[PDB]
Design a protein around this ligand. Structure first.
Ligand SMILES: CS(=O)(=O)NCC#Cc1ccc(S(=O)(=O)NCCC(F)(F)F)cc1
Ligand SMILES: CS(=O)(=O)NCC#Cc1ccc(S(=O)(=O)NCCC(F)(F)F)cc1
Lengths: 187, 187
């Protein structure tokens, strides 16, 4: 309500500048509320970012669950694309959220909890592919899954932030899908 | 001299706690010098970390140049192993150096300059492998190289920091080499 206005303001301001350069007064002003009214909904601007990141992570997780409840190259591409579109639609929050992992235990723990879930699901799909005889028994599935998820984390976030170096955003899906399919199916 | 003692002290203290929890007075005391004598060799504790990271990055780069001036799976493993051993021998500096990328333009630019070099060298070796007919012309070599280097950055540093999630350090070389060889040679 006022909560949503605060969150919408924070997402808008993060498009232009870092959390460090955004005051509680900036978020209050943008949301049309006082400073003490702000503090009724959120203990800090840090908790605003935690809630924004929580919503974006849950949106991606819910989109991947929808896919899971329904060719091998297209199967992986469709799944990687959940993360590309979801985080790529929320670049300001992605970026600020990754930077807050260093300073926020709640942000580090949110990101860690979802990465463990996404890795466990990746490993379960590789195992299914091995069980049906489509993928060879090479590396431990859980270790392969970990490295691939870490690759995607670093490569997606570098591309969205326009880091040097980065894969251009228009090439990153093809790039990741190639490495996933060759490393999962390759003998 | 006193410079080396300051650097050795900083590396020792970073084994126990973050830069934020290390004072110029801590580095001076450890190096057996006064606070103003410290400031003669370094403008700040941040510049000490920049110099430590500079030395570790150059050690890895010089080891990779030595290799370059001399089976396909073993060739990539030997090269990845430069980074595994070099950064893995300097875990405190690696960790503090990666955290300083967020706050230090000099640290962000050092890391970016060497990543561009290492990616350009990776791409040149893939191209050579394609030219000799050992590797298929799949992805653009420079884009494949970028994602693989980013994977290694994230996966090595997660393992060395014992992050959750991470590939166990005793499995990370096998894990990365498998993804490199299948993605470089796989059709
Ligand atoms: C259509 S399907 O059945 O759902 N395909 C199977 C799948 C899947 C799957 C895809 C991508 C990733 S990840 O590595 O991209 N996510 C980590 C967060 C990051 F994006 F930060 F990496 C993880 C799992
Ligand atoms: C024996 S040889 O001829 O030298 N083999 C060819 C090679 C190579 C080569 C290996 C590993 C990497 S990287 O991706 O590990 N480094 C990025 C820094 C990071 F470690 F942070 F990633 C880059 C290039």
């Amino acid at each position: 309500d006022r909560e949503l206005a605060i969150l919408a303001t924070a997402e808008n301001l993060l498009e232009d500048r870092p959390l460090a350069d955004i005051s509680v007064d900036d978020l209050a002003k943008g949301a049309g509320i006082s400073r003490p009214t702000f503090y009724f909904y959120f203990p800090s601007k840090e908790a605003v970012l935690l809630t924004l990141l929580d919503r974006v992570v849950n949106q991606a997780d819910m989109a991947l669950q929808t896919l899971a409840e329904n060719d091998r190259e297209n199967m992986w591409r469709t799944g990687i694309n959940v993360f590309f579109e979801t985080f790529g639609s929320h670049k300001a929050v992605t970026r600020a959220g990754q930077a807050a992992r260093a300073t926020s235990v709640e942000v580090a723990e949110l990101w860690s909890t979802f990465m463990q879930k996404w890795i466990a699901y990746t490993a379960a799909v590789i195992d299914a592919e091995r069980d049906r005889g489509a993928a060879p028994r090479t590396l431990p599935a859980h270790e392969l899954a970990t490295a691939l998820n870490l690759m995607n984390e670093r490569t997606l976030f570098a591309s969205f932030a326009g880091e040097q170096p980065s894969v251009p955003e228009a090439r990153v899906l093809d790039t990741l899908v190639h490495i996933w399919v060759t490393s999962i199916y390759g003998e």
